Amino acid sequence: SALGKLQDVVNQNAQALNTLVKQLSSNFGAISSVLNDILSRLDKVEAEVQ
Amino acid sequence: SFVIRGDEVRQIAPGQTGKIADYNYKLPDDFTGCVIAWNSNNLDSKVGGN
């Protein structure tokens, strides 16, 4: 527990980089978060909106 | 310039799919322009069918 200042710097960079990856699973209001799922399910002019 | 039945006019638009759109006359996604249509039954129909 003495080395908490270095462990904190390891943990913050790992927790930021995992949060960046989990944001790929998010919809942001799109019909799906999987990019090929949109393109397989929707007509090309609407797929560009999603 | 061309002739079609009144039901088919909806296919004359950018990003459409259908028999007229895909096998007779296709418009691009960046189409900058106007689509003008009018009834021609008086010129283009004939007795027993034209």
Give A27→chain B minimum CA distance, Å: 25
Reported as half-sphere exposure (CB side, CA atoms, 13 A), residue B25 has a value of 12
Residue contact A45–B17, C-beta within 8 A:
no
Q: Distance of CA B40 to CAs A3, B5, B11, Å?
A: 87, 9, 18
Look up tokens 């283009």; give the residue: B44
Task: Using the structure block, give the residue that is written with the tokens 């990856």.
Answer: A21
Q: Resolution limit in angstroms? A: 3.0
Q: Is B15 on the interface with A (CB under 8 A)?
A: yes
Alpha-carbon gap, residue B19 to A3, rounded angstroms? 72
Chain B residue numbers touching A43 (CB-CB < 8 A):
15, 17
